[PDB]
Write a protein that binds this ligand. Sequence first.
Ligand SMILES: *[C@@H](C)[C@H]1/C(=C/c2[nH]c(/C=C3N=C(/C=C4\NC(=O)C(CC)=C4C)C(C)=C\3CCC(=O)O)c(CCC(=O)O)c2C)NC(=O)[C@@H]1C
Ligand SMILES: *[C@@H](C)[C@H]1/C(=C/c2[nH]c(/C=C3N=C(/C=C4\NC(=O)C(CC)=C4C)C(C)=C\3CCC(=O)O)c(CCC(=O)O)c2C)NC(=O)[C@@H]1C
Ligand SMILES: *[C@@H](C)[C@H]1/C(=C/c2[nH]c(/C=C3N=C(/C=C4\NC(=O)C(CC)=C4C)C(C)=C\3CCC(=O)O)c(CCC(=O)O)c2C)NC(=O)[C@@H]1C
Ligand SMILES: *[C@H](C)[C@H]1/C(=C/c2[nH]c(/C=C3N=C(/C=C4\NC(=O)C(CC)=C4C)C(C)=C\3CCC(=O)O)c(CCC(=O)O)c2C)NC(=O)[C@@H]1C
Ligand SMILES: *[C@H](C)[C@H]1/C(=C/c2[nH]c(/C=C3N=C(/C=C4\NC(=O)C(CC)=C4C)C(C)=C\3CCC(=O)O)c(CCC(=O)O)c2C)NC(=O)[C@@H]1C
Ligand SMILES: *[C@H](C)[C@H]1/C(=C/c2[nH]c(/C=C3N=C(/C=C4\NC(=O)C(CC)=C4C)C(C)=C\3CCC(=O)O)c(CCC(=O)O)c2C)NC(=O)[C@@H]1C
Ligand SMILES: *[C@H](C)[C@H]1/C(=C/c2[nH]c(/C=C3N=C(/C=C4\NC(=O)C(CC)=C4C)C(C)=C\3CCC(=O)O)c(CCC(=O)O)c2C)NC(=O)[C@@H]1C
Ligand SMILES: *[C@H](C)[C@H]1/C(=C/c2[nH]c(/C=C3N=C(/C=C4\NC(=O)C(CC)=C4C)C(C)=C\3CCC(=O)O)c(CCC(=O)O)c2C)NC(=O)[C@@H]1C
Ligand SMILES: *[C@H](C)[C@H]1/C(=C/c2[nH]c(/C=C3N=C(/C=C4\NC(=O)C(CC)=C4C)C(C)=C\3CCC(=O)O)c(CCC(=O)O)c2C)NC(=O)[C@@H]1C
Ligand SMILES: *[C@H](C)[C@H]1/C(=C/c2[nH]c(/C=C3N=C(/C=C4\NC(=O)C(CC)=C4C)C(C)=C\3CCC(=O)O)c(CCC(=O)O)c2C)NC(=O)[C@@H]1C
Ligand SMILES: *[C@H](C)[C@H]1/C(=C/c2[nH]c(/C=C3N=C(/C=C4\NC(=O)C(CC)=C4C)C(C)=C\3CCC(=O)O)c(CCC(=O)O)c2C)NC(=O)[C@@H]1C
Lengths: 162, 162, 162, 266, 172, 172, 172, 172, 75
Amino acid sequence: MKTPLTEAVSTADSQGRFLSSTELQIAFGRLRQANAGLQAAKALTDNAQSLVNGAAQAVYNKFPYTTQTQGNNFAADQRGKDKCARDIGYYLRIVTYCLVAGGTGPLDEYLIAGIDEINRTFDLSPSWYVEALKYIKANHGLSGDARDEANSYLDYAINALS
Amino acid sequence: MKTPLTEAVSTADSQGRFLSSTELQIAFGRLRQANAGLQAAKALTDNAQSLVNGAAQAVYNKFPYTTQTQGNNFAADQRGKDKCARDIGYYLRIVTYCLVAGGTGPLDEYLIAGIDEINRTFDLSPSWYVEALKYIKANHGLSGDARDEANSYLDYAINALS
Amino acid sequence: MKTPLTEAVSTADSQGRFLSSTELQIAFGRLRQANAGLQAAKALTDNAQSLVNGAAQAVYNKFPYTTQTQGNNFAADQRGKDKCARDIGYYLRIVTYCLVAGGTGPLDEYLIAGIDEINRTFDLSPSWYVEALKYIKANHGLSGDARDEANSYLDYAINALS
Amino acid sequence: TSLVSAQRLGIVAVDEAIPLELRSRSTEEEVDAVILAVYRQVLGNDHLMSQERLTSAESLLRGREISVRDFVRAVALSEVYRQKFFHSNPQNRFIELNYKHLLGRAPYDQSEIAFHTDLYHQGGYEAEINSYIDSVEYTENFGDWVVPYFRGFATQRNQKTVGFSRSFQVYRGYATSDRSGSRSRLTRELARNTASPVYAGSTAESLRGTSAGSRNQMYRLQVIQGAAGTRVRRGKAEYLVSYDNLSAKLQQINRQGDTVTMISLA
Amino acid sequence: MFDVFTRVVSQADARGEYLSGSQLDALSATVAEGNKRIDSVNRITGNASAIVSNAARALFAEQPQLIQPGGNAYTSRRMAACLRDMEIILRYVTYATFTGDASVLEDRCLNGLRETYVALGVPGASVAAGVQKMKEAALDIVNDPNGITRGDCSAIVAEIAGYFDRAAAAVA
Amino acid sequence: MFDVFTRVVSQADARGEYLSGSQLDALSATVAEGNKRIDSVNRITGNASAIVSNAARALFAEQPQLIQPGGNAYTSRRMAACLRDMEIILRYVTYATFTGDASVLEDRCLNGLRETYVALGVPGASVAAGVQKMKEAALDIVNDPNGITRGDCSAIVAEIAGYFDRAAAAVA
Amino acid sequence: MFDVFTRVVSQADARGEYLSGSQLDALSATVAEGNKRIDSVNRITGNASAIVSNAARALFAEQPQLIQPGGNAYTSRRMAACLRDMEIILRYVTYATFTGDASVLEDRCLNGLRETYVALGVPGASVAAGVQKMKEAALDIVNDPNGITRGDCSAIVAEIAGYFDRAAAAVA
Amino acid sequence: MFDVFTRVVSQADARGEYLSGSQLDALSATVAEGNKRIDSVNRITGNASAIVSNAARALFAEQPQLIQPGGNAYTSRRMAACLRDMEIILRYVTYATFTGDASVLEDRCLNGLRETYVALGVPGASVAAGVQKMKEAALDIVNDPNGITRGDCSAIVAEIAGYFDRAAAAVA
Amino acid sequence: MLGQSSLVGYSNTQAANRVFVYEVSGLRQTDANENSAHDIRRSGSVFIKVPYARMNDEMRRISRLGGTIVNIRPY
Ligand SMILES: *[C@@H](C)[C@H]1/C(=C/c2[nH]c(/C=C3N=C(/C=C4\NC(=O)C(CC)=C4C)C(C)=C\3CCC(=O)O)c(CCC(=O)O)c2C)NC(=O)[C@@H]1C
Ligand SMILES: *[C@@H](C)[C@H]1/C(=C/c2[nH]c(/C=C3N=C(/C=C4\NC(=O)C(CC)=C4C)C(C)=C\3CCC(=O)O)c(CCC(=O)O)c2C)NC(=O)[C@@H]1C
Ligand SMILES: *[C@@H](C)[C@H]1/C(=C/c2[nH]c(/C=C3N=C(/C=C4\NC(=O)C(CC)=C4C)C(C)=C\3CCC(=O)O)c(CCC(=O)O)c2C)NC(=O)[C@@H]1C
Ligand SMILES: *[C@H](C)[C@H]1/C(=C/c2[nH]c(/C=C3N=C(/C=C4\NC(=O)C(CC)=C4C)C(C)=C\3CCC(=O)O)c(CCC(=O)O)c2C)NC(=O)[C@@H]1C
Ligand SMILES: *[C@H](C)[C@H]1/C(=C/c2[nH]c(/C=C3N=C(/C=C4\NC(=O)C(CC)=C4C)C(C)=C\3CCC(=O)O)c(CCC(=O)O)c2C)NC(=O)[C@@H]1C
Ligand SMILES: *[C@H](C)[C@H]1/C(=C/c2[nH]c(/C=C3N=C(/C=C4\NC(=O)C(CC)=C4C)C(C)=C\3CCC(=O)O)c(CCC(=O)O)c2C)NC(=O)[C@@H]1C
Ligand SMILES: *[C@H](C)[C@H]1/C(=C/c2[nH]c(/C=C3N=C(/C=C4\NC(=O)C(CC)=C4C)C(C)=C\3CCC(=O)O)c(CCC(=O)O)c2C)NC(=O)[C@@H]1C
Ligand SMILES: *[C@H](C)[C@H]1/C(=C/c2[nH]c(/C=C3N=C(/C=C4\NC(=O)C(CC)=C4C)C(C)=C\3CCC(=O)O)c(CCC(=O)O)c2C)NC(=O)[C@@H]1C
Ligand SMILES: *[C@H](C)[C@H]1/C(=C/c2[nH]c(/C=C3N=C(/C=C4\NC(=O)C(CC)=C4C)C(C)=C\3CCC(=O)O)c(CCC(=O)O)c2C)NC(=O)[C@@H]1C
Ligand SMILES: *[C@H](C)[C@H]1/C(=C/c2[nH]c(/C=C3N=C(/C=C4\NC(=O)C(CC)=C4C)C(C)=C\3CCC(=O)O)c(CCC(=O)O)c2C)NC(=O)[C@@H]1C
Ligand SMILES: *[C@H](C)[C@H]1/C(=C/c2[nH]c(/C=C3N=C(/C=C4\NC(=O)C(CC)=C4C)C(C)=C\3CCC(=O)O)c(CCC(=O)O)c2C)NC(=O)[C@@H]1C
C-alpha cells in the first residue's frame, strides 16, 4: 500500500529506526489532506451511479463501435454494457478508496497491478477506460484540495493505462 | 541526508514511479514544519555561543572530575576545555542543520554515524554529551512547533548516545 | 569459538579436507601452551577473591566519583559495589576460561560480544573495567608462559573496551 | 540427487537445473532469460506483474552497466522484495527467505539467525541484505554472473547435513512460491539444533489397506508429548489416523496437553 | 501493513462497497485526533532509550534469575539480545500507534515470537513483565501535562495501552 | 523429466536389463506416430491464447462468485495470476504431449500446486473446471480435419486428454 | 541526494558555520513558493504519459531517420527503450523540481549518460531534441492558469526550464 | 563447535564458577594423551583412502543388492556419492578425535543424517555396517605397534570407537 | 557510464551516494577459489562499479582472489 503512514512506517522499519521528525511531518501532511480527501470520497460516493452511467455513455459516444459490433469484448448487448458499467464502477470505487487512504495504494493493489494482461487477454481497449476517467474528472464537481487529489488519482489511472 | 523530500524521492525512484499524492502530502507536511524549523534554527544560532558555554559549564558542574584530573580525554587544561566547547558547538550546529533540513539526516551524516567508536577510541563518555544536550533542551526557550522539533532532534542525539 | 583445535577443524572443514600436518602442528602448539594455561587459570582461581576486591578498590580509587555520586550506574551504595565486584569477577572468571580453552573464545562468546550495548544503555564507563583489568595484570603474580598468555587475554579485553 | 530419490522427493527439476551465466556479448534474449531467472528465483517464484518490474535495474543489466550480482542485489533491495518478504513477515521467516532466495539453501544454525538479526538491528534492511550477496558463499557459488539457484538438495562443501532435510522445509515444490505473512517452519528445529523427517513429494504417503476409514485417507500427526494414563516412551510421537478418528485424536492429544507440531495427509 | 484508513479500505474492497457515511465520519474523527497521536508517538520515541533501560533494570531487579549465571539474560550477547527485544517491542508499539492499526506490530514483531521464545528457552512471562514496565513508563510519558497543549488524550492512551497489552499477551 | 523413450530406459536400467524386442517395437510404433503428435502440439500452441481466454470466460460465467469483489479472481493482480495459471497448465500439457510422458507435469506443473492453492485460498475445484474447459477446447482444435493430412489421431487425443485430466485431478 | 535545504546545509557544514540570516530568509522564501512547486510537480506527473508520447511522436515526425530500418529507434525493443528513456528523464526532472535541487537528476540519470549513449550508438542530439520537446510540453502544462489559484509561477517555471536544460545539455 | 576444553568451559560458565582443581587436573590428564591423539588422527588420515575403499568393498561383497542394478549404490553417480559419504563420515570422526569432543561430528555431520538417508532411501543399516567396517580398520591402524613409540592408547582407541559408534547409531 | 541509481542503494547519505570504478587484473585460479562453482572467464582488465559502502568488501574479495587493483576512478 502506497499511503503516507504505511510508507513512513515501512521506511522506518526497513531502516530499523524509531519514527523521527521526518515521519511526523509525513503524518502532518496526511492530516492536512485527509478531510478534503474524505469529503471527496463522499462526494464521489453520493454521485457514483450517475457518474458511472455518464462515463459509460461518454465511452459509448466517443467509441460508437463498442455498442454495435458483436463480440465478447464489446458492449453491444446488455451483458457487455453491464460489464462496462461494472468496470467503470470499479475504477470510481477504488478511486474513492485512494482518496480515503491518501495515496495510490488502493489503485496499485486492486486495479493497476496486472491490468495490462487483463486488457490484452480480453481485448479491452485501455482508451475506453481513459475516456471514462476523463469524464469522471470533468464531471465530479469538486473544488480545491479534494479536486486536486481526486484528479491526481484519476490521472494516475490514466497514465497507467497509457 | 534523511529529509522528507529526499526520502520521498528515493522511495519513488526505487519503484521507478513518478511522485504521486503521497509524496505531495509529504512535501505539504515539510512545508507546514519548515517555517517553524527555520525560526528554531535562527533562534538557536542567535545565542549559540551562550547555549554552548552554558552546556559546557553544565557538563563541568555535573561532572567535576572532568575539569580536575589530568588526561587527554579530560578538560582539566585549556586544551581540553577548547576541545569540549568545540564538541558542544558541533552538536548544536548539527542540530540547527537538522532543524533547517527537516530531519535527523545531518545528525546521522555528520555526528551519529561513528560517534560510538570515537567515544570508545578517545575514552569520552556519552553521559557528558547527554548532559550538554539536556542543558540545550532546558535553556533554548523555544515554544510550540519550533520547540517540539528541536527537542526531537536533541532527544534523538541523547538516545543515540545512551 | 576461537581455540586452536576448533579453529583447525573449522578451517579444514571449510576446505572439506582431512586434517593435515598443519592442523597437527596447531594441536602441538596447543599442547605446548596448555599446561601453562592450566596453572595460570588455577593461580587466578585461588587468588580470584583478592584480585576482584583489589581491582574494584583500584577502580574506586582512580575514579573516586563512582563512590559518592548517586545513580544506578555508580557504586555509591552497597548495591552498586556488589554489581561492580560481580562484573570484575565475571571478567576474571572468563579470563580463566580463556586460559583453559587456549584462545579468546570464552571472552568473545560470553563477555566481548554485546558489551558495547550494555555499557551504553546502562551508562557504564569502559574505562572502569580497563582499570580493573590493568590491576589484574599488575597483581596476578604469574611468570613465563602463564603470564604472557593471561596478559594477552587481559589486553584483548582492554583493547575491546578501548 | 539421482532419479530414484528425486521422483520420491519431488526435486527432479532442481537436480536437472543448469546454472545460468551471463557471458560477455550476450544477446537480447540471453539478458531476457537472465532477468526472468533472477525474478523467478530471487522473488521466490511469484507471478511478477509488469508494473512490479525493475525497469531501470534491468536496463542497467542490459547495457552491461551492472553485473548479475548487482541486478540480484537491486531486486533484493527493491520495494517489491520488501513488500512480499519483509514488511509483513517475522524476522526469522524473513531471513530464511533471504537464505533461500539469495544463497539457495536453508539456514544451518541458530547462530545464523542471531546473525542477520543483530545485523538488521544495527544496520537496517540494506546492510542485512548485502550480507548475503557480499558473502563468501555467494561469491564462491555464483560470482558476478551466475543467477543464484537452489543448492540445498546437493552436497555442498562446508555444509551441515541437516540443511538437506531443512531444504524440504523451505522448498515446497516446483509449483510453489513464498507468497502467503507466514511463520517459519524451522524455528524450533533451528533453536534446538534438531532435524525433522522429510515429508516431501510422495514420501509423506503411507499404506492404508482396510485400516483407513470411510474415505480412505490417513493423516500423520507429529506431536511433542510428555507425561501428563499409559507410559510415554518418546518425546516425539507420530500418529497415523483415519479422517473419521481425526477429531478424536486431536481432542485426546489436546486434553493431555501435547503440542501438535505438524499434521499432513498420508 | 495497514494503517487506520487502509484497513477500512481493504474491508470495503472485499465487499465491493463504498465507504459508508458512518465509516467516513469515523475516519474523520480519527483524523481530528491525529495531533495527539503524533504527540504520543514523539514522546515515546524521545524517551525510548530511557524507557527500555529503566524497564529492563526493574525487570532484572524483580527477576534476579534472569541475570544470574546460566539465566537467559546472562552473558553480554544474551543481555544485548534482551535489550534489543525490549527496544523492538517498543518500536513496533510506536509504529502501531502511528498507523492507528496493530498490523505492523502483529506481522513484524508478535507473529511467531512466542514459539521462538519457547523454542529458545527465553522466558516469555518475563518478557511480558518487561513490556508492562515499558507500558506504564510510556503511559506516564504520554500523559505528562506540562509543555504541551492541554487536552484529553484518554483514547490515544487506551489505544497505546492496548498495543502494549497485545505485545505482552503475545510474548507469554 | 522423461520422454516416451527415457521412461522405458529408466525402467530397464532399474531392472538392469536391455530393452526387449516388444519394447523396441512399441517405441518404433510411437516413432511412426510422431508426426501427428507434433501436429497436436503445434495446434494447441497456435491457439493457446484463444483456449485460455475462452476457457477463462466460460469459467467466470459459470462461477461468477470468482470475479465478484472478494472473490479469488477479483482485482487485476489476482485475475492476471489466474490467467497465468491457465496458460501455464496449458503449456505444460503441451510439454507432456511433446515428450509423450507425463513426468513433466508431476515434476514441475503439479509439484506442490495443490499445497500452493490451499495456502493462498485459490479454489482448486474451479481451477479443475477451467482445466476441463481448456481440455475440451484443445481436443476440438487437435481433432480439426481442415488444413491437415487426414488420419487417425485418436491415440494422441486420448493421451492429451489424459494429461489434461491429470492436471485437473492435481488441483480438484 | 540533496534537496534545497540539505544543499545549503552541506555547504555550511563544510565551512563549519551556522546558516546565516540571509540563507534562512532565502529558505523561507523557498517555503513560501512550496505550494507552486507542488502544483508544478503534480501537473507534470498528471500529464507525464501525454508529454512523453507527444514529444516522441514529434521527435519522430522530424528526424525520420530514427524510425527507418537500421535507425536507432527501429525494432520494437529499441523504440520501447527510447520511450522508456524519455519517461525516465522526465521523471528525474520531476524529482529535481520536487527537491528543489538538481543532485538527483545529475547523479542518478545525467552523469555518464553521454558516454553510455555514445558507447551504444544512441544519438545524443536527437534525445536532446526530445528533451526539448518534453520541456516545451511540460512548461505549457505547468503555465496553465485554468483550474488553479492565480499567481506568479515564473520562478518555479524557470527552475523547471533549468532542469530540462541540464538534461538536454548533458545528453547531447 | 566444542573441543575437550571448551565443553568444560561452557558448562562452568553456565554454572558461573571457575573450573575446580579436579577439572583442571582432568584437562592436564587430557593434554597428557595429546600426543597419542595426534598420532591416531594422523594414522587414520594417512590410510583414509584404504579405509574407505576396503570398507566399501567389504560392504558391497556382503550386501550385493546395493551394487546390483536398481540398488542404492548402483550407477556411478550413486556409487561416487556413497564413497563420498563414507569419506565424509571418516573425516568427521577424525575431526571429533582431534577436538576430543563429539560436537563437530553430531552438529555438522550426524544431525539430520538419519532423516536425510530416510528421505533419500539410502539404507541406514547398510551405512551403519560400512561405518562399522571403517571402525574395525581404523582401530587396527591406530593400534599398529610398528614405527611408533611404545605406550597405552586404550583410552583414545575407546574414544575413537565411541565416535564411530555415534556415527553408526546416527545413520540407522 | 551509468549504474549509480541502482548501485548506491537507499542509505540516502551523501557518503554512500558515491560509486567508484575498480580496474582489476590477474584473476586466476588460486587456492582461494578452488571450490568455485563458476569459472573465471577473463583475467585481463575488468571494471567493477562499487559503491562506497561496499568498497571495503569488494577489494578484500579482489585481494582474496589474487586480483590486482591497478586503478580506481571516481564515477
Ligand atoms: C503555477 C505552479 C500555477 C499556480 C499555482 C498556485 N497554487 C496555489 C495554491 C495551492 N495549490 C495547492 C495544491 C494542492 N492541494 C492538494 O490537495 C494537492 C494534491 C495533494 C495539491 C497539488 C494548495 C494546497 C494551495 C494553497 C491553497 C489554495 O488552494 O490556494 C497558488 C496560490 C499561492 C500559494 O502558493 O499558496 C498558486 C499561485 N498558479 C498559476 O497561475 C500557475 C498556472
Ligand atoms: C491429428 C493430430 C490430425 C492429423 C495429423 C497428421 N499429420 C500428418 C502428417 C504430417 N504432419 C506434419 C507436420 C508438420 N510439418 C511441418 O513442417 C510442421 C511445422 C514444423 C509441422 C507441424 C508432417 C511433417 C507430416 C508428414 C507429411 C504429410 O503432410 O503427410 C499425418 C499423416 C501421417 C503421418 O504420420 O505423416 C496425420 C495423420 N490428421 C488428422 O486427420 C487429425 C485432425
Ligand atoms: C596409539 C595412538 C599408538 C602410540 C602413540 C604414541 N605416540 C607417542 C609419541 C609421540 N608421537 C608424536 C607425534 C608426531 N610427531 C610429529 O612430528 C608428527 C607429525 C606432525 C606426529 C604425528 C610425538 C611428537 C610424540 C612425542 C615424542 C616421541 O616421538 O615419542 C607416544 C609416547 C607417549 C607420548 O604421549 O608422547 C605414544 C604412546 N603408541 C602406541 O604404542 C600405539 C600404537
Ligand atoms: C467498458 C469501459 C468497456 C467494456 C467492458 C468489458 N469488460 C469486460 C471484462 C472484464 N473487465 C475486467 C476488469 C476488472 N476486473 C477487476 O477485478 C478489476 C479491478 C478491481 C477490473 C478493472 C476483467 C478482469 C474482465 C474479464 C473477466 C470478467 O468477465 O469480469 C468485458 C467482457 C469481456 C469478455 O470476453 O467477457 C467487457 C464487455 N466493453 C465495452 O465495449 C466498453 C467500451
Ligand atoms: C566535552 C563534552 C568533554 C570533552 C571533550 C573532548 N573531545 C575530544 C576529542 C574529540 N571529540 C570528537 C568529536 C567529534 N568530532 C567531530 O567531527 C564530531 C561530529 C561532527 C564530533 C562530535 C573527536 C572526533 C575527538 C578526537 C579527535 C579530536 O581531538 O579532534 C577531546 C580530546 C581527547 C583526546 O584524546 O585528545 C576532549 C577533551 N572532554 C571532557 O572532559 C569534557 C567533559
Ligand atoms: C496527548 C497525549 C497530550 C496532549 C496533546 C495535544 N497536542 C495538541 C496539538 C498539537 N500538537 C502538535 C504537535 C507537534 N508539533 C510539532 O512541530 C511536532 C514535532 C515535529 C509535534 C509532535 C501540533 C502541531 C498541534 C496543533 C497545534 C497546537 O499545538 O495546538 C493538542 C490540541 C488538540 C489538537 O488535536 O490540536 C493536544 C490535546 N495534550 C495533553 O494534555 C496530553 C498530555
Ligand atoms: C564496576 C567496575 C563499576 C560499576 C558497575 C555496575 N555494573 C552494572 C550493571 C551491569 N553490569 C553488566 C555486565 C555484565 N553482565 C554479564 O552477564 C557480563 C558478561 C558475563 C557482564 C560483563 C550488566 C549486563 C549490567 C546490567 C544488568 C545487571 O544489573 O546485572 C551496574 C548497575 C547498573 C544499573 O542500572 O543497574 C553497576 C553499578 N559501577 C561503578 O561505579 C564501578 C566503577
Ligand atoms: C485461475 C484458473 C484460478 C486462480 C488462480 C490463482 N493462482 C494464484 C497464484 C499462484 N499460481 C501459482 C502457480 C504456478 N506457478 C508456477 O511457476 C507454476 C508452474 C510450475 C504454477 C502452476 C503460484 C506458485 C502462485 C503463487 C503466487 C504467485 O504470485 O505466483 C493466484 C494469486 C493469489 C493471490 O494473489 O493471493 C490466483 C488468483 N484463482 C481463481 O479464483 C481461479 C479459479
Ligand atoms: C530516445 C529519445 C532515443 C533512444 C534511446 C535508446 N536508449 C537505449 C538504451 C539505453 N538507455 C539507457 C539509459 C538509462 N537506463 C536507465 O536505467 C537510466 C536511469 C539510470 C538511464 C538514463 C541504458 C542504460 C541503455 C542500455 C540498456 C537498454 O538497451 O535498455 C536504446 C537501445 C540501444 C540498443 O538497443 O542497443 C535506445 C534505442 N534512441 C533514439 O534513437 C532516440 C534519440
Ligand atoms: C529480554 C527482555 C528477555 C530476553 C530476550 C532474548 N531474546 C532472544 C532472541 C531473539 N529475539 C528475537 C526476536 C526478534 N528479533 C527481531 O528481529 C524481531 C523484530 C522483527 C523480533 C521480535 C529473535 C528472532 C531471537 C532469536 C535470534 C537472536 O538470537 O537474536 C535472546 C537470545 C536467545 C539465545 O541467545 O539463545 C534473548 C536473551 N531474554 C531474557 O531472559 C529476557 C526476559
Ligand atoms: C554409502 C555407504 C551408502 C549410500 C550413500 C548415498 N548418499 C547419498 C546422498 C547424500 N549423502 C548426503 C550426506 C552428506 N552431505 C554432506 O554434506 C554431509 C556432511 C555434512 C553428509 C553426511 C546428502 C546430503 C546426500 C544428498 C545430496 C547429494 O547427493 O549430494 C546418495 C545418493 C542418493 C541419490 O539418489 O542420489 C547415496 C547413494 N548409498 C548406499 O546404498 C550405501 C549404503
